């Protein structure tokens, strides 16, 4: 839980400090991250920015976070069939569920 808590605080401080973010390079896997911090539509911009983001739910953030944590924390291959692997997967799933739920209400 503390990992998700410290993670959400970073996004909150980012949205509360940066007025916005324009187009940036490396949008292949970073498209889901840009949807975490959503600035307001500019006065000189068009009405197709919020329209496309309104009908799109942030669901790739959970996958990117799960893969990031999986690569950050090391595990043993032979231990996959052990009792520890089951509890580890259960904890990661329980955390990912609340994490995805927190962002689900963000766009909605």
């Amino acid at each position: 839980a503390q990992i998700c808590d410290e993670a959400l605080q970073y996004a909150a401080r980012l949205r509360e400090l940066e007025p916005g973010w324009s187009a940036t390079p490396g949008c292949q896997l970073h498209d889901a991250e840009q949807l975490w911090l959503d600035p307001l539509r500019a006065q000189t911009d068009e009405t197709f920015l919020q329209r496309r983001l309104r009908g799109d739910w942030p669901a790739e953030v959970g996958n990117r976070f799960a893969n990031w944590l999986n690569r950050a924390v090391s595990s043993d291959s032979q231990i996959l069939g052990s009792p520890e692997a089951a509890q580890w997967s259960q904890e990661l799933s329980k955390e990912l569920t609340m994490f995805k739920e927190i962002l689900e209400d963000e766009r909605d």
């Binding site: 292949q28 799109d56 739910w57």
Partner: protein, 328 residues
Amino acid sequence: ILSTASVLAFERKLDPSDALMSAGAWAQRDASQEWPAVTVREKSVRGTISNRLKTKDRDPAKLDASIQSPNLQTVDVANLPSDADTLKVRFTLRVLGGAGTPSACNDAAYRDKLLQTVATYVNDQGFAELARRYAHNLANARFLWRNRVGAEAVEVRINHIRQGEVARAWRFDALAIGLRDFKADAELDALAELIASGLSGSGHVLLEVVAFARIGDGQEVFPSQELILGQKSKTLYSVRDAAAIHSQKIGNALRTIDTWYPDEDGLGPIAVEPYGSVTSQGKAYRQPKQKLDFYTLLDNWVLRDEAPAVEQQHYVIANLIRGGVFGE
């Protein structure tokens, strides 16, 4: 007693080069040169979520939501020119030799024992069996993985380059040659003899293999996908604006000879690899529990001088020819 060397390496032999590809008409098969190359291109591909659902079946409401947010993806595809019904693949092959000669060994006694065993095996019987097996793979189109499937006519031409000039040419048919059965032929025997000589070190050997497969007008080839590492999920390997196949990807098929695996031979040939691992099958034949393992066989035939069955000896020689890293 005699122990093994913690560091052992064997340079690979029979190392081929990249395989270039081109397109042409069967009528113009004689004019193989000057055929234009296939240039990779990008196209937008939009697809839904076909992944298997999780253990807990969700409500159907969420499913309809995914349709409202399609997944945009860009991939790379390679298709033959507007007017071309035959694909051409050209790749060279060299025979270095000295398979048994170890590249590096910590202990001299082990190296001497290995060279002695290799010389003894060669004197008893030559590599003609391995050369004959390789000849069949080179003759047939086993090198192609997906391009061969669904082909009208496949024609292979294996030439021999000596001092820069063509010495002896050969023309075979992959379709006529059995995929799961090996048959004897005068040309196959001649090629096997040439390969055995090259491996033994009787002289330089260079063989240029060129295949022509009839696929169809505007068909789509299947080159080797590269690592993604422009939101491109699929990147096709391309050199000099031309599609090609990886050297190892070619040498694996060209080395798919071993068929004496512990199984009943229900499938086709399996490439010599440690632990008899298979990517497609997802299983590993010749498990370490059995005595047929390459490491166990070599350790026994070296320390205890126990010569295993001719089949096991052939498999061990093939592994040494392929080369690798052993010991610790």
